Design a binder for these strands. Structure first.
Length: 278
RNA sequence: GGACAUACAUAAAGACCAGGC
């Protein structure tokens, strides 16, 4: 429901304009619930048919209609940055979350190359990144941007595979990689419910030929696994012994809010002012 | 991965009988 958007709109007030696309349903944009931000500065668009579309990011037509709409609403330049927080329930298949979400990862990366301006930025949620498919998608972003990193914020839960790819400075000439990833998404859609799938988007010999990329990718995965293993074992110990507690949670909270410049206040429904007093 | 039924209301009706001015 656009929690990420609320912070950006609240931080920049009206000096910002947001464009949204998400699946219609229980997890649609709750623009009414933006208590800290002016929801009028945001515009949801659900692909083909605009407001009446389904918002399927994996579907190409939703991407295309949104793509034309976003470029038009940005003087044909695109957005300064894209945020992407895609995920769905994998209840009882948590170990397969990467493989199950692979097309959603691709479509969010394709969306970055479709609507981010030159010199613009991208941030996308991902999970595990073990498969050559997911690593080849990160390699294409590393080619297309001045700088890329894999980052797990402390606001992500330590025991889950959730991390963010963060890309800074979209290069010129990314059109071929965009149109390639658009063709790969069409191929994934054709292979839905078949015994075949797209297993590579960059050859393993190309990825492993960049030793500097490969040495970062391995080290990022193994460091994340090591921290996730400790955090999973910690949760298991805190199930077995219910007297265990983190004593510093209230201290760490106060310091994080101070550091990030976030006021320590409760969520209050605006207040209803009358138009004369306001 | 909350109420004073402040509903004063039991008044059968109907009948005959007795008395009052």
């Amino acid at each position: 429901p656009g929690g990420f958007s609320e912070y950006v709109l609240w931080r920049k007030k009206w000096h910002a304009k947001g464009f949204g696309m998400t699946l219609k349903g229980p997890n649609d944009f709750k623009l009414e619930d933006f208590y800290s931000a002016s929801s009028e500065l945001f515009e949801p668009y659900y692909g083909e048919g605009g407001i009446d579309g389904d918002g399927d990011i994996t579907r190409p037509e939703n991407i295309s209609a949104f793509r034309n709409f976003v470029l038009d609403n940005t003087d044909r330049k695109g957005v300064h940055f894209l945020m992407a927080d895609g995920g769905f329930s994998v209840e009882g298949q948590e170990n397969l979350q990467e493989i199950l979400s692979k097309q959603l990862l691709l479509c969010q990366f394709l969306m970055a190359l479709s609507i981010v301006r030159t010199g613009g930025h991208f941030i996308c949620k991902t999970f595990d990144l073990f498969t050559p498919f997911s690593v080849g998608l990160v390699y294409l972003l590393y080619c297309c941007f001045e700088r890329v990193c894999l980052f797990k914020p402390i606001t992500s839960r330590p025991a889950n595979s959730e991390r963010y790819v963060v890309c800074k400075g979209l290069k010129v000439g990314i059109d071929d990689v965009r149109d390639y990833l658009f063709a790969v998404n069409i191929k994934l859609n054709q292979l839905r419910n078949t015994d075949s799938d797209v297993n590579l988007v960059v050859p393993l010999e190309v990825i492993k030929g960049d030793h500097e990329f490969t040495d970062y990718m391995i080290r990022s995965n193994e460091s994340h696994c090591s921290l996730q293993i400790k955090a999973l074992a910690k949760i298991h110990a805190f199930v077995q012994d219910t007297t265990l507690s983190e004593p510093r949670q209230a201290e760490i909270r106060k310091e994080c809010l101070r550091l990030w410049g976030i006021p320590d206040q409760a969520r209050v429904a605006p207040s209803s002012s009358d138009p004369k007093s306001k």
